[PDB]
Design an enzyme around this catalytic site. Structure first.
Site, PDB file in Angstrom:
ATOM      1  N   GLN A   1     -57.392  10.398 -10.568  1.00 20.81           N
ATOM      2  CA  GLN A   1     -58.810  10.577 -10.208  1.00 20.81           C
ATOM      3  C   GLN A   1     -59.389  11.753 -11.086  1.00 20.81           C
ATOM      4  OE1 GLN A   1     -60.991   8.214  -8.840  1.00 20.81           O
ATOM      5  NE2 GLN A   1     -59.349   6.867  -7.888  1.00 20.81           N
TER       6      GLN A   1
ATOM      7  N   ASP B   1     -57.838  -5.381 -15.315  1.00 24.75           N
ATOM      8  CA  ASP B   1     -58.446  -6.288 -14.287  1.00 24.75           C
ATOM      9  C   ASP B   1     -59.911  -6.206 -14.487  1.00 24.75           C
ATOM     10  OD1 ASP B   1     -58.468  -3.699 -12.377  1.00 24.75           O
ATOM     11  OD2 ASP B   1     -59.937  -5.274 -11.501  1.00 24.75           O
TER      12      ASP B   1
ATOM     13  N   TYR C   1     -61.121   1.235  -3.677  1.00 24.66           N
ATOM     14  CA  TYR C   1     -62.740   1.010  -4.133  1.00 24.66           C
ATOM     15  C   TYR C   1     -63.468   0.710  -3.109  1.00 24.66           C
ATOM     16  CZ  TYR C   1     -65.913  -1.088  -7.257  1.00 24.66           C
ATOM     17  OH  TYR C   1     -67.231  -1.282  -7.734  1.00 24.66           O
TER      18      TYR C   1
ATOM     19  N   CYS D   1     -61.074 -21.586 -29.043  1.00 24.80           N
ATOM     20  CA  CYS D   1     -60.342 -21.591 -27.684  1.00 24.80           C
ATOM     21  C   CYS D   1     -59.549 -22.668 -27.293  1.00 24.80           C
ATOM     22  CB  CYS D   1     -61.445 -21.292 -26.688  1.00 24.80           C
ATOM     23  SG  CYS D   1     -60.824 -21.309 -25.071  1.00 24.80           S
TER      24      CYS D   1
ATOM     25  N   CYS E   1     -62.536 -26.306 -23.223  1.00 20.98           N
ATOM     26  CA  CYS E   1     -63.021 -26.340 -24.489  1.00 20.98           C
ATOM     27  C   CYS E   1     -62.283 -27.436 -25.332  1.00 20.98           C
ATOM     28  CB  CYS E   1     -62.607 -25.021 -25.300  1.00 20.98           C
ATOM     29  SG  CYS E   1     -63.723 -23.622 -25.012  1.00 20.98           S
TER      30      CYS E   1
ATOM     31  N   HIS F   1     -63.110 -21.000 -18.499  1.00 19.52           N
ATOM     32  CA  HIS F   1     -63.010 -20.778 -19.972  1.00 19.52           C
ATOM     33  C   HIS F   1     -62.992 -19.344 -19.921  1.00 19.52           C
ATOM     34  CE1 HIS F   1     -64.071 -19.676 -23.961  1.00 19.52           C
ATOM     35  NE2 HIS F   1     -65.022 -19.188 -23.480  1.00 19.52           N
TER      36      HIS F   1
ATOM     37  N   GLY G   1     -61.485   5.601 -11.038  1.00 17.32           N
ATOM     38  CA  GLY G   1     -62.651   6.220 -10.893  1.00 17.32           C
ATOM     39  C   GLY G   1     -63.547   5.708 -12.179  1.00 17.32           C
TER      40      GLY G   1
ATOM     41  N   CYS H   1     -58.416 -23.309 -24.525  1.00 15.83           N
ATOM     42  CA  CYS H   1     -58.481 -23.475 -22.968  1.00 15.83           C
ATOM     43  C   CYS H   1     -58.586 -24.987 -22.724  1.00 15.83           C
ATOM     44  CB  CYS H   1     -59.240 -22.855 -22.143  1.00 15.83           C
ATOM     45  SG  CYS H   1     -61.128 -23.126 -22.002  1.00 15.83           S
TER      46      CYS H   1
ATOM     47  N   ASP I   1     -54.479  -4.218  -4.636  1.00 18.92           N
ATOM     48  CA  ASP I   1     -55.065  -2.920  -4.479  1.00 18.92           C
ATOM     49  C   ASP I   1     -54.904  -2.264  -2.899  1.00 18.92           C
ATOM     50  OD1 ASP I   1     -56.698  -0.810  -5.497  1.00 18.92           O
ATOM     51  OD2 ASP I   1     -58.423  -1.999  -5.826  1.00 18.92           O
ATOM     52  N   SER I   2     -55.262  -1.037  -3.010  1.00 17.44           N
ATOM     53  CA  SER I   2     -55.412  -0.488  -1.901  1.00 17.44           C
ATOM     54  C   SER I   2     -56.321  -0.088  -0.765  1.00 17.44           C
ATOM     55  CB  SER I   2     -54.703   1.149  -2.306  1.00 17.44           C
ATOM     56  OG  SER I   2     -56.018   1.788  -2.947  1.00 17.44           O
ATOM     57  N   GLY I   3     -57.551  -0.576  -1.188  1.00 17.77           N
ATOM     58  CA  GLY I   3     -58.859  -0.508  -0.455  1.00 17.77           C
ATOM     59  C   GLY I   3     -59.313   0.750  -1.134  1.00 17.77           C
TER      60      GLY I   3
HETATM   61  N1  LIG Z   1     -57.945   1.750  -5.840  1.00 13.93           N
HETATM   62  C1  LIG Z   1     -58.758   1.514  -6.638  1.00 13.93           C
HETATM   63  N2  LIG Z   1     -59.238   0.471  -7.215  1.00 13.93           N
HETATM   64  C2  LIG Z   1     -60.453   0.524  -8.152  1.00 13.93           C
HETATM   65  C3  LIG Z   1     -60.868  -0.685  -8.612  1.00 13.93           C
HETATM   66  C4  LIG Z   1     -60.442  -2.084  -8.131  1.00 13.93           C
HETATM   67  C5  LIG Z   1     -59.047  -2.789  -9.059  1.00 13.93           C
HETATM   68  C6  LIG Z   1     -58.673  -4.123  -8.359  1.00 13.93           C
HETATM   69  C7  LIG Z   1     -57.247  -4.138  -8.138  1.00 13.93           C
HETATM   70  C8  LIG Z   1     -56.996  -5.322  -7.664  1.00 13.93           C
HETATM   71  C9  LIG Z   1     -57.622  -6.324  -7.083  1.00 13.93           C
HETATM   72  C10 LIG Z   1     -59.009  -6.117  -7.194  1.00 13.93           C
HETATM   73  C11 LIG Z   1     -59.787  -4.965  -7.930  1.00 13.93           C
HETATM   74  C12 LIG Z   1     -61.849  -0.827  -9.539  1.00 13.93           C
HETATM   75  N3  LIG Z   1     -62.818  -1.640 -10.141  1.00 13.93           N
HETATM   76  C13 LIG Z   1     -63.574  -1.065 -10.931  1.00 13.93           C
HETATM   77  N4  LIG Z   1     -63.416   0.127 -10.880  1.00 13.93           N
HETATM   78  C14 LIG Z   1     -62.439   0.632 -10.063  1.00 13.93           C
HETATM   79  C15 LIG Z   1     -61.813   1.682  -9.991  1.00 13.93           C
HETATM   80  C16 LIG Z   1     -60.813   1.601  -8.921  1.00 13.93           C
HETATM   81  C17 LIG Z   1     -60.398   2.787  -8.100  1.00 13.93           C
HETATM   82  O1  LIG Z   1     -60.668   3.910  -8.773  1.00 13.93           O
HETATM   83  N5  LIG Z   1     -59.250   2.681  -7.299  1.00 13.93           N
HETATM   84 ZN   LIG Z   2     -62.446 -22.101 -23.647  1.00 21.25          ZN
END
Ligand SMILES: Nc1nc2c(CCc3ccccc3)c3nc[nH]c3cc2c(=O)[nH]1
Ligand SMILES: [Zn+2]
Ligand SMILES: Nc1nc2c(CCc3ccccc3)c3nc[nH]c3cc2c(=O)[nH]1
Ligand SMILES: [Zn+2]
Lengths: 368, 368
Positions: B185, B262, B88, B300, B305, B331, B212, B302, B84-86
């Site tokens: 966004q 994710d 969040y 399941c 289980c 699990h 978002g 896994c 991710d970029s930061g």
């Molecule tokens: N950059 C970014 N990340 C988000 C994440 C984290 C996903 C993530 C990626 C990789 C590793 C961990 C988390 C969000 N999680 C819940 N809602 C989210 C929205 C955004 C968003 O708008 N922008």
């Molecule tokens: Zn399981």
């Protein structure tokens, strides 16, 4: 280095400070022993760490641990390691067990796997784990317990302690390099504790644990039992209070002659938003900490408090960053080690009574 | 192997199934991507794992990760990794930030350390982490948001997306071997989402994320936004819904054209006593499970289980054995991968519409 040599350097009232010398290093007492983990400063570090034997038995398995070089390899830790016997899980998982005089068999797993514990198998498993301090196989008596249940439980555990002693002595590599502790049981009953202490001392052990406490009894009752139970154990051997406890629990237990401690609270609290400080525990989720620029504790020398404010940790936890709980946990483990250091210093100085009074006044005032 | 090639093998309604080929391997879509950890059942395994960049920036640090060989060495994982970029944490930790057009500086630590994120620094950090899929630096707009706040936030992120593109392209090794996703966004507002999609497609990206969402809006609102937002993105490129979601969220998002997911829920639920099953989630702490001999889920495949009954996990957690939460989490992560496989199978068969209906009927009946 000797196999196991406990020396008392200074005493105040019932409190002692000294050292346990073993082949893998020295343990300063009173000691706090944190739970060890798989491998992934000094003022906040321990002298010995613990293996949770039941967990290791199931994952990855005792034989797998032994093949990779034991817990010292697994945990990346060359200093002493203490392993439990399983006697706590005999209680805490009792509804999945069948008990007999021979031992404790656990319910079969869905893959046909089946685990059993006995005095013989527990010692064998602790040997395979490479443990330096081996605990006898006991039963942590449930609490509360009738005098009848407490007595039958304790008597069986004393027979298991004799079998544990013999099993340990039957393995020359273990008997020559490790140490073995007996575990006192007897619930809250003075006469049963005396019978248990008598039985253990006749067998003979390197150290003696006070078992069957930190099972929900509360500090007043715990202190009351320690008041008569610790003087029953041999004075010149280490006394290990299993599962205790909160910082003020530890101070008062030291006052009653305890030398070694373990407790789930540093990690359980740290993952649940509670940090220990000299001004008492704090709940970092409380809104008062949202703009608090201070570290968790303003004396603490741990790595977390050199870097992280209450505000940061508060918002990390609120934001769902698991780093928040990691920092809380790392600080709690380090705070426990600094507490033990202050305890040892004060006994060495002949000022432990005054330390305990000052500690409690500040810890209970909660001016954090 | 190509740098990044998304192929659609089958389609049903708005749902797609296919593959993303990269140099380090193939990602089957729709995909669930679990959070990677430090290194310590193929049918339950992922094709790609995630690096939580903000966490890694603070511990152990981006440069330290790079010196030890990047996240593939750190996580013991040779397949693709998305970081991710930061953006969040720009939102979730906003009260510790100062924002400007240049970027986001976090509050100075107690050791004088200071961290900042910008399009340029975020791309640089993701490069040092060895990421295969790089996210543009954005702001996850807070929810709820006024149309005014949503618009200024989205417009700033679209300027940051262009800067992210340029920073990514300025590093030949990253541009030749990794891929870059833009992040849409615009909060819940259709026109702003359209402007964001337009801005991203003009810049041009390898994949497109719906940002978002999964910020507390609720499933009805989330689905509504996906209804108009996903068709705004380029059809022939992957669509990544960040943070989503519950199993039924994922099914409905696939129905609306999402290719990658994710979610914190598998680990958060597993640590809080909740397990996902085909008959809905179960709270393993409920006393009904105390003597339930069945695994968490009857189908399941896994590792948990195959071995562990509901009764065992129920009592492990009640007894405070950390192994209980580990099994729940493992699990849940494995169950998510089986859900994605069943989703991919059903689209390939042209029976996804019927799968989704059968899934929901059984999952919401809660006959576990
Ligand atoms: N950059 C970014 N990340 C988000 C994440 C984290 C996903 C993530 C990626 C990789 C590793 C961990 C988390 C969000 N999680 C819940 N809602 C989210 C929205 C955004 C968003 O708008 N922008
Ligand atoms: Zn399981
Ligand atoms: N064998 C045994 N262990 C106890 C523990 C576990 C301490 C432990 C040692 C090593 C590793 C982990 C845990 C107790 N914890 C709280 N109360 C406790 C009582 C007993 C007891 O009576 N017997
Ligand atoms: Zn600290």
């Amino acid at each position: 280095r000797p196999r196991f040599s406990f020396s008392i350097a200074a005493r105040e009232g019932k409190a002692r400070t000294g050292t346990i010398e073993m082949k893998r290093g020295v343990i300063r007492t009173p000691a706090f022993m944190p739970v060890g983990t798989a491998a992934t400063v000094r003022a906040t570090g321990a002298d010995i760490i613990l293996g949770n034997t039941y967990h290791l038995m199931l994952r990855p398995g005792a034989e797998r641990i032994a093949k990779l070089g034991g817990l010292h390899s697994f945990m990346g830790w060359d200093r002493p390691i203490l392993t439990d016997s399983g006697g706590y899980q005999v209680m805490s998982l009792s509804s999945l067990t069948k008990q007999s005089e021979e031992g404790v068999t656990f319910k079969s797993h869905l893959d046909g796997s089946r685990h059993m514990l006995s005095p013989e198998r527990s010692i064998e498993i602790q040997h395979l784990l490479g443990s330096d301090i081996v605990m006898a196989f006991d039963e942590c008596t449930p609490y509360p317990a009738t005098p009848s249940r407490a007595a039958s439980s304790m008597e069986r555990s004393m027979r298991w302690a004799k079998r544990s002693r013999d099993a340990f002595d039957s393995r020359k590599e273990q008997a020559e390099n490790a140490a073995l502790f007996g575990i006192q049981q007897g619930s809250v009953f003075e006469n049963l504790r005396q019978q248990s202490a008598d039985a253990l001392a006749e067998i003979g052990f390197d150290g003696y644990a006070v078992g069957g406490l930190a099972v929900g009894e509360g500090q007043d009752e715990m202190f009351r039992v320690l008041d008569f139970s610790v003087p029953m154990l041999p004075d010149d051997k280490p006394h290990y209070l299993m599962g205790v406890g909160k910082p003020d629990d530890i101070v008062g237990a030291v006052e009653r002659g305890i030398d070694m401690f373990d407790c789930v609270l540093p990690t359980r609290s740290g993952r649940n938003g509670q940090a220990f400080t000299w001004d008492g525990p704090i709940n970092i989720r409380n809104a008062r900490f949202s703009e608090d620029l201070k570290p968790l504790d303003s004396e603490c020398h741990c790595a977390v408090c050199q870097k992280w404010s209450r505000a940061y940790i508060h918002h990390l936890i609120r934001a769902g960053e698991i780093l928040g709980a990691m920092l809380m946990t790392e600080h709690n483990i380090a705070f426990y080690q600094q507490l033990m250091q202050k305890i040892r210093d004060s006994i060495s100085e002949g000022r432990f009574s005054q330390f305990a009074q000052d500690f409690r006044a500040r810890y209970f005032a909660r001016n954090s």
